[PDB]
DNA sequence: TAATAATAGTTTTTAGTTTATTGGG
DNA sequence: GCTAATAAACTAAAAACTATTATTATG
């Protein structure tokens, strides 16, 4: 779908070493934030595992201090934020999951950043 | 804080810089080679934080991302790297030029729109604050669009353009055996009478390596000199001469050569267990007893005025022993931005002071938490050189007091005289020896070596270069000059036996 | 104290010297020593320093595996103080 | 319903260490 | 003939300098 697509694009997007690989996949990350904001009852369970992958995506894909990576990783982070504000328990078996994962990402390079 | 600058090399790709009339010199192209080798040198050891590019026209091929032919870009805008450096060696060279040519085209025509429309959008893809846009154009003919008149047409209302949106292109000379025909094609295209058969327009400085941090101008501090309590006046501080140190090194891993962070802990013996700056105590064992104190009483006792300047008087230039240095002087300059009106203030005390030939001593504090010393402020009137450029700024020289304890004890030293005559010999020595000083004639020679064996090994060169040290004393050239007069006024002082060493 | 030394004009001319730094910025002679907040014990607080990895869950670099650099320009090559 | 205002992010000293190194006895 | 600081280089550490960016204000 749309979401799986832009998140295949995005886990194609930062192969190439450019701070145009960046601009493109926070673009592509903005346009994920302004759609699946939205969803009736149905895309957000698609949303979830593509969150799963794409969140543990760039958890071991990014792995870069390179800002590109930075201001994507936080426009990421800020939709996970407004998502989960009201998104309900049912994100859960990814939380601790993504617990493992954010402090992992804080303690790593992002707290060289 | 200003813009940067911006540098855009671009060379011809064609016959004329490959070839010279006189194979012994360098050619066209492989100079033009050592001239940005050089450039970027320069440049990484002064500005690495600007950016630099490379792009040729009149190649054959061509790769551009605006994708017109012969116009093909070899670097895009960036800071210089010792990559960038070997990526151009590798075409340096009589040989380097061949390979060139062998996966490179040259030759084709070109069109001077074409390579404006190009780095104007490079220019244009830099999104930094920039205040330079020097581009330096290689090639030593200004005919090839006089041949075709619309494109020499197109061309000179595009450099117009372009010169009227802040881009500066100036004109690197080339050796034409014809003349390189300045005024002809040029001072009507190019921002700004022989018709150089040569091409050293100023390319000597351009091969002239330079070993200079060169830092941009900031502000110190703006500090706000009170002048009994309430009449107060905003002033800059800067320091025109500031010691240049060598950069930091820079911890890195033995097995990846990636930098390695190092974090700190402070904690627990018999436990070892982490501790917290609560648990830290200052103490200080006097004689046998231990004062236990902490950290915020020891910046609250150096803690006495505002960070700022209080007077205390004004006194004759004369009043001041030249020997009585503290530390190296600051600049003072007027400053509007927190007090409005104050550059008047700052003229009319100038004048009666300049007048008067009194500076004005002060109490300095530089920040919170720190010792007010004493200040001398002596005038400091504006000087033009020939070219009436400021060779002296116009403020005041800040200088240091010692305090009585900042003065240390002699044994006491007695008077002896000398003869008349060997003040004589000291003079004609002095003489064959005199010369005019100029502050920019002597370097530091450990960090001129220092940084070629940095370039050498980051060039993975072979050799390093030689620091030429300007501070050892030519003693064949002295002993030549004086010959006699060493010995004679030997004989005069010293005894023939007692020389100077026992 | 004195600097016992020669000054030295060309290779033919060189007279013994005793500097003395008549002006000399003075500083404090006692540091402010760090002990503990109950025992006021600096045996009881001692210090060390820690060289781990920035990834790889800090991943701890041996002490003497870490070796110095220096920025050049865009770039960092590795370069040790021998 | 949409404008302003402290505000953290790179340099640069500089106080307190840490190195062995000459200078003696 | 019996050991003796020392400025340099090294840190931490603290402030000044541009450079932004929520925030009501109003509706």
């Given at each position: 779908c749309s979401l799986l697509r832009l998140q295949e694009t995005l886990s194609a997007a930062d192969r190439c070493g450019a701070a145009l690989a960046g601009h493109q996949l926070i673009r592509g990350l903005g346009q994920e934030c302004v759609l699946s904001s939205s969803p009736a009852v149905l895309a957000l369970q698609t949303s979830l595992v593509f969150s799963r992958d794409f969140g543990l995506l760039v958890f071991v894909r990014k792995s870069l201090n390179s800002i590109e990576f930075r201001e994507c990783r936080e426009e990421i982070l800020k939709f996970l934020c407004?998502?989960?504000?009201?998104?309900?328990?049912?994100?859960?078996?990814?939380?601790?999951?993504?617990?493992?994962?954010?402090?992992?990402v804080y303690t790593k390079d992002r707290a060289a950043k | 804080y200003s813009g940067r600058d911006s540098l855009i090399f671009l060379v011809d790709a064609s016959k004329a810089m490959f070839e010279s009339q006189s194979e012994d010199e360098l050619?066209?192209?492989?100079?033009?080679?050592?001239?940005?080798?050089?450039?970027?040198?320069?440049?990484?050891?002064?500005?690495?934080?600007?950016?630099?590019?490379?792009?040729?026209y009149?190649?054959?091929?061509?790769?551009?991302?605006?994708?017109?032919?012969?116009?093909y870009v070899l670097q895009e805008l960036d800071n210089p790297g010792a990559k960038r450096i070997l990526e151009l060696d590798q075409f340096k060279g009589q040989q380097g030029q061949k390979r060139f040519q062998d996966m490179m085209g040259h030759g084709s025509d070109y069109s001077l729109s074409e390579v404006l429309w190009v780095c104007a959008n490079l220019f244009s893809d830099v999104q930094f604050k920039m205040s330079h846009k020097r581009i330096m154009l290689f090639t030593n003919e200004d005919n090839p669009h006089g041949n075709?008149?619309?494109?020499?047409?197109?061309?000179?209302?595009?450099?117009?353009?372009l010169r009227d949106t802040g881009i500066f292109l100036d004109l690197m000379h080339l050796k034409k055996p014809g003349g390189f025909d300045i005024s002809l094609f040029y001072r009507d295209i190019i921002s700004i009478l022989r018709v150089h058969f040569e091409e050293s327009?100023?390319?000597?400085?351009?091969?002239?390596?330079?070993?200079?941090?060169?830092?941009?101008?900031?502000?110190?501090?703006?500090?706000?000199?009170?002048?009994?309590?309430?009449?107060?006046?905003?002033?800059?501080?800067?320091?025109?001469?500031?010691?240049?140190?060598?950069?930091?090194?820079?911890?890195?891993?033995?097995?990846?050569?990636?930098?390695?962070?190092?974090?700190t802990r402070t904690f627990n013996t018999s436990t070892g267990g982490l501790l917290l700056p609560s648990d830290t105590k200052r103490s200080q064992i006097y004689g046998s007893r231990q004062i236990i104190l902490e950290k915020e009483e020891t910046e609250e006792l150096k803690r006495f005025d505002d960070p700022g300047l209080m007077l205390m008087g004004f006194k004759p230039l004369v009043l001041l022993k030249k020997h009585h240095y503290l530390r190296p002087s600051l600049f003072v300059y007027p400053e509007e931005s927190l007090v409005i009106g104050s550059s008047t203030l700052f003229s009319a005390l100038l004048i009666k002071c300049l007048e008067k030939e009194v500076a004005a001593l002060c109490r300095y504090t530089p920040r919170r938490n720190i010792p007010p010393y004493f200040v001398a402020l002596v005038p400091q009137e504006e000087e033009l050189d020939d070219q009436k450029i400021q060779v002296t700024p116009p403020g005041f020289q800040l200088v240091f007091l010692p305090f009585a304890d900042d003065k240390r004890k002699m044994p006491f030293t007695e008077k002896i005289m000398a003869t008349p005559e060997q003040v004589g010999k000291?003079?004609?020595?002095?003489?064959?020896?005199?010369?005019?000083?100029?502050?920019?004639?002597?370097?530091?020679?450990?960090?001129?070596?220092?940084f070629r064996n940095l370039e050498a090994l980051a060039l993975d060169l072979m050799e390093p270069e030689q620091a030429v040290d300007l501070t050892l004393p030519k003693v064949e050239a002295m002993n030549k000059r004086l010959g006699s007069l060493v010995d004679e006024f030997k004989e005069l002082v010293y005894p023939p036996d007692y020389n100077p060493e026992g | 104290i004195h600097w016992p030394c020669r000054l030295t004009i060309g290779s033919n001319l060189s007279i013994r010297i005793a500097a003395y730094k008549s002006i000399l910025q003075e500083r404090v002679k006692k540091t402010w020593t760090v002990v503990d907040a109950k025992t006021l014990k600096k045996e009881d607080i001692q210090k060390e320093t820690?060289?781990?990895?920035?990834?790889?869950?800090?991943?701890?670099?041996?002490?003497?595996?870490?070796?110095?650099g220096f920025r050049y320009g865009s770039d960092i090559v590795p370069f040790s103080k021998v």
């Open positions: 407004i998502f989960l504000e009201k998104m309900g328990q049912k994100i859960a078996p990814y939380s601790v999951e993504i617990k493992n994962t954010c402090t992992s | 050619t066209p192209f492989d100079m033009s080679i050592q001239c940005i080798q050089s450039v970027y040198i320069s440049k990484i050891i002064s500005s690495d934080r600007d950016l630099l590019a490379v792009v040729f009149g190649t054959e091929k061509d790769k551009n991302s605006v994708n017109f032919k012969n116009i075709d008149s619309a494109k020499a047409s197109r061309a000179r209302t595009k450099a117009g353009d327009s100023k390319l000597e400085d351009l091969l002239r390596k330079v070993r200079a941090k060169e830092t941009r101008k900031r502000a110190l501090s703006r500090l706000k000199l009170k002048l009994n309590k309430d009449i107060v006046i905003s002033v800059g501080i800067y320091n025109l001469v500031q010691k240049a140190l060598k950069p930091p090194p820079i911890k890195l891993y033995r097995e990846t050569n990636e930098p390695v962070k190092t974090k000291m003079k004609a020595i002095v003489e064959k020896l005199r010369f005019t000083y100029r502050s920019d004639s002597f370097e530091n020679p450990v960090l001129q070596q220092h | 820690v060289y781990c990895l920035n990834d790889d869950d800090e991943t701890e670099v041996l002490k003497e595996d870490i070796i110095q």
